[PDB]
Every structure is written in C-alpha cells, then in structure tokens.
C-alpha cells in the first residue's frame with residue numbers, strides 16, 4: 178500500500194528476471210546538480226568512517242565504500258521512499274542498508290567483469306553477510322543509481338536474466354592482482370576487469386563461461402535506479418571514450434535486518450589489509466526492529482540523520 182511499492186506484476190517480473198526497473202529517484206536535472214556538488218564534497222575525507230586507507234596495498238575499491246556514513250546527500254539518498262518502498266516489497270518490514278559503493282568509469286575504462294556475490298566473503302574466506310542457515314536465501318538487494326547518464330558507450334550495466342538462483346563463483350577462492358592491466362584485457366571480445374583482479378578466477382568450474390549471448394543492456398538516465406539481486410549475473414560495458422565525461426554509478430546494498438552483518442568481525446579484511454569498522458554501522462531504512470547482533474548508526478559522522486529529505 179506504500180506510495181512506491183512494487184505492483185504485483187513488477188514483483189513477479191523481479192522474481193523471474195532478478196532485476197526490476199529502472200525507476201526514477203530524481204529528475205536528470207536534479208541529479209546533475211546534486212552530483213556536481215556531491216562530487217566536490219566527497220574529495221574531503223576528513224569525516225569519513227574509514228581513515229588511513231593508504232595502509233591497504235594492492236587492489237581495493239575501499240575508498241569508494243560507505244560514504245553515506247559521512248555525506249549529507251547520500252544519507253538521504255539511501256532512505257528515498259522511491260527506493261525503499263520497492264526494496265520493502267522484496268525484503269519485508271525491517272531492512273538495513275549495510276554497504277554503499279561508488280563505481281566510476283572514466284573515459285576508456287574496461288567493463289566490469291561478470292560476477293555474482295552471495296556471502297561477500299573477505300580476504301580470509303569469512304562472509305560479511307550471513308542469512309539464516311536453515312533457509313535457501315542469499316546475497317543482497319543492490320540498488321544502483323545513475324549519478325550520470327549510463328549508456329552502452331560509457332559503460333552501463335548489463336544483466337543475464339534469471340541467473341540469480343545459482344552461483345557460478347566461489348567467493349572463498351583467491352584472485353591474483355595485476356597492477357598494469359591498463360584496461361586492456363579482452364575477455365570474449367570485451368575489455369573487462371575487476372579493479373586489477375579477474376573474477377573468472379573465482380569460477381567454480383574453470384572452463385565454464387557466462388551466457389553472455391543472453392546479456393541485456395540497462396541504459397539509464399541520470400537520477401534513475403535499477404534494483405537487482407547481487408547473486409544475479411551482472412557486469413558493465415566498457416567506457417569507449419567516445420564521450421569525454423565519466424560515468425558514475427552509486428550502489429546501495431540492502432538486507433533484511435535478521436541477516437548478520439559483519440558477523441564475528443571488527444574489520445573489513447581486504448587482500449592488502451584490514452580496515453577498522455569502529456565508525457561503521459548498518460542503517461535501518463525500513464522498520465524499527467533489528468536484532469542486537471547488528472551494529473546500527475542513526476546519523477552520519479557530521480550528525481545528519483538518516484532520513485529522506
């Protein structure tokens with residue numbers, strides 16, 4: 178009954194395909210203006226949850242994590258009813274935003290590798306989210322918002338429909354780090370990579386390949402968002418550099434509050450080091466009940482409440 182709830186037909190399509198949308202959070206004009214201001218603000222990490230990131234060596238997107246914990250706009254964004262009423266339709270009455278991540282594609286950048294994520298296992302094989310072990314559910318609902326236009330030419334997302342119910346990768350396997358890939362590694366005809374790593378190295382079967390012939394593009398205008406299971410096969414196109422503007426996506430990740438977030442961990446464990454979770458918490462964006470085993474925050478590190486404005 179909530180204003181932006183998924184219709185029954187949208188809920189059915191989400192169940193079949195593993196994604197639904199795009200939907201509008203902002204007009205393109207509002208998004209363009211907001212991102213202009215926000216991009217400049219984010220250069221200042223003085224209030225960021227994670228400090229001393231220079232101690233983490235090798236490949237890591239950690240600098241793009243969890244800026245909602247310090248930023249005024251992002252703190253509202255993760256709580257937008259346009260997003261949350263739809264996540265509620267899938268995840269129920271009590272839901273946490275446990276992770277956010279920026280995905281820049283600069284002109285010429287490689288496409289994101291085909292991947293699925295279920296446990297979000299850390300460097301030591303330890304899951305960062307755990308669902309009830311007596312049940313068959315896994316992963317997180319990803320809401321990917323286009324902070325810029327997202328088109329094939331600048332590296333929009335792509336999905337293989339209906340692949341969210343079986344994992345092709347083992348997140349406890351180890352990838353090797355390539356500092357000098359130069360966005361140049363061609364994988365079945367497409368430049369792809371994973372932050373210096375190769376997600377193919379996580380495959381359960383080394384000889385298996387994604388059903389890329391069945392991939393579908395997801396072009397989006399600035400201010401739109403797409404909702405998908407992290408367990409769905411997903412990737413992005415390369416940025417051809419035809420446009421000299423970078424593409425920016427912002428992912429917010431949601432789990433029901435009964436899911437254990439960073440269980441038995443006081444750090445994000447990357448290949449190159451540990452990042453303290455001292456100033457981390459999950460944000461309760463829907464409902465008001467969460468079990469005590471999940472650490473919550475109610476405000477950013479600059480005292481801005483997590484609520485939609």
Ligand SMILES: CCCCCCCCCC(=O)OC[C@H]1O[C@@](CO)(O[C@H]2O[C@@H](OC)[C@@H](O)[C@H](O)[C@@H]2O)[C@@H](O)[C@@H]1O
Nearest residue numbers: 267268269270313314315316317341342343406408433
């Ligand atoms: C009071 C209301 C509380 C509601 C809590 C939210 C429940 C959502 C569960 C879900 O759909 O999870 C789907 C995830 O689990 C996966 C893992 O493969 O699916 C499993 O769940 C089942 O959904 C009932 C099956 O359809 C699939 O075969 C699948 O294995 C993927 O579809 C997703 O990652």
Ligand SMILES: O=C(O)CCC(=O)C(=O)O
Nearest residue numbers: 280289319321413426428
């Ligand atoms: O923006 C991208 O290129 C990848 C996004 C993604 O993999 C995700 O949010 O799950």
